[PDB]
Design a protein around this ligand. Structure first.
Ligand SMILES: [Cl-]
Ligand SMILES: [Cl-]
Ligand SMILES: [Mg+2]
Length: 231
């Protein structure tokens, strides 16, 4: 086999982050009777997402700390509707973090695909997500067992797509570059990052992307395609 090491992103590649996070935010929204402050959950969540997206970029650029990232992203939607209650935002975030890692939703066919690949490849996670969440998410969903090691941006202090985290992931796992494949849903973090260091990439397209500044090594629309690609 050409590849010996498969590096998977976690969120929206293996774990159903968008689905699981929407469910969790809605549960916490309802718990705190947020219809008092917003027209609907979607009024809340669209505001939350707009700022959260901006914030994760600032974080990757070293413009906010993880702590400031978290403080701002749960407070932003409340202050956007005139609620200046920072303590309420903090209680909300505590409940979000208590619940999110308990969710078990995976991307389609993930368990089957991982069970198929595990005997034949070293399987790794390469993720920017929080150490106190990532392995818990994986256990809850029953997929932690497939992965030999989890490599986090927090291990190094550098987020995808910066090159350092990819070179670190290779060394940390005794992996040769030419024997490694990055599999992920983020064009900007996973595919651009891996391409940047000369590592092959399989772009898992769940955003209906049609425009490519460069072509990924492989372009798949289902994790099932991995079983065919890497048979
Ligand atoms: Cl990530
Ligand atoms: Cl597990
Ligand atoms: Mg992802």
């Amino acid at each position: 086999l050409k590849y010996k090491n498969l590096f998977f992103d976690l969120d929206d590649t293996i774990w159903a982050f968008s689905r699981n996070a929407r469910d969790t935010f809605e549960e916490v929204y309802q718990k705190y009777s947020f219809d008092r402050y917003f027209d609907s959950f979607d009024h809340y969540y669209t505001l939350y997402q707009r700022r959260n997206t901006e914030l994760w970029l600032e974080y990757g650029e070293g413009k906010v700390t993880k702590e400031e990232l978290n403080r701002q992203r749960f407070f932003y939607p409340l202050q956007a509707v005139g609620v200046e209650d920072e303590a309420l935002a903090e209680r909300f975030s505590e409940d979000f973090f208590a619940i999110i890692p308990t969710k078990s939703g995976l991307m389609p066919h993930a368990k089957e695909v991982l069970e198929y690949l595990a005997p034949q490849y070293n399987l790794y996670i390469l993720s920017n997500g929080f150490r106190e969440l990532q392995s818990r998410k994986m256990r809850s969903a029953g997929v932690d067992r497939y992965f030999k090691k989890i490599i986090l941006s927090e291990d190094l202090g550098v987020l995808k797509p910066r090159p350092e985290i990819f070179h670190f992931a290779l060394s940390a796992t005794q992996s040769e570059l030419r024997e490694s494949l990055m599999i992920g849903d983020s064009w900007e973090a996973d595919i651009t990052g891996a391409h940047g260091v000369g590592m092959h990439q399989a772009f898992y397209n769940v955003t209906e992307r049609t425009v490519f500044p460069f072509q990924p090594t492989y372009h798949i629309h289902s994790l099932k395609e991995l079983m065919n690609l890497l048979e």
